[PDB]
Symmetry: C2
Subunit: 184 residues, 2 copies
């Protein structure tokens, strides 16, 4: 039932259990659903950061693991992970790690598809909904904090070329439309 | 399924269900499946203590639950973190990935006789209160001991530490294993 909270919430970022969340005064996300979904997101993202940074994972596999440990990790263990991790703020993908209060440090970023020619920015967020995408960005050089310079906006070709802190590369419309970037 | 561990440490109808899986009084695949869970609930304890700053006596109730959610890749990478842990924070030997299991000719403390000396190497984590007792009186792994007075009745034994002299009861002394050198 709690698997849809990190969905209904992450939408702005099967009815069986939907009528079961509202059975807890939880759901139309009310005031409690925000902190519930934000807590579960905190656990998931923190697990991603821990597996990647400490246990030497790659940012594409790290998801399918944390989707089960979230239902077997205590709050003590989670707080000591958050302590060892340096109290982080973001995924290895750039997904913001909220605080225990509802901080959710969202960065002022728009999608690489929303940019135009001559614009520059820093890769602050990469979508994780598909590991092949993260494998591709690992293949090129699109990591976090990478600085991109948009060269060509060919909407007719459904592409957009960018320059990377290294070389140029051509990214498709759905490719460069996951990856979020902060301007200038 | 947790019985796989307790039947391995010493070596109802809950054990027959492992003969159903072809595991048990341990078979080759049975003692090879106990090696798994035993590596889990051991690498997990030494990871909690050594990396995430735990303090024993409360790593049991955690690893006993994480053991049912750790993948072989996760366990192998934890082992690669520690690199390459041969023994529990309580003293239980980490079974080698091949299945060697280090060799500790270790006797009980109560089973020792008067005058015997030896390095302690394994402590039971069944009772965390007992672990806090062992921490406060000053006994931990690798501290040489000397059986001074094994009193068969009523359940007492006086031992000399290298830190002292402790009068340990039988329920306590039945939780210390010791090698002799």
């Amino acid at each position: 039932a709690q698997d849809y909270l990190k969905v209904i919430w992450t939408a702005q970022e099967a009815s069986e259990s939907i009528r079961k969340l509202a059975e807890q005064g939880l759901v139309t996300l009310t005031d409690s659903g925000r902190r519930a979904a934000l807590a579960m997101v905190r656990r998931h993202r923190l697990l991603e950061t821990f597996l990647v940074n400490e246990l030497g994972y790659r940012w594409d596999e790290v998801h399918d693991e944390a989707e089960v440990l979230e239902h077997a990790v205590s709050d003590r263990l989670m707080a000591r992970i958050d302590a060892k991790l340096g109290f982080p703020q973001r995924d290895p993908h750039g997904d913001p790690i909220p605080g225990a209060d509802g901080q959710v440090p969202t960065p002022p970023a728009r999608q690489l598809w929303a940019c135009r020619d001559g614009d520059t920015g820093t890769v602050a967020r990469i979508s994780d909904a598909d590991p092949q995408m993260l494998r591709y960005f690992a293949s090129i050089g699109i990591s976090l904090d990478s600085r991109l310079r948009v060269l060509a906006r060919r909407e007719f070709a459904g592409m957009i070329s960018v320059a990377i802190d290294s070389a140029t590369v051509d990214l498709g419309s759905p490719a460069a439309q996951a990856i979020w970037v902060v301007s200038l």
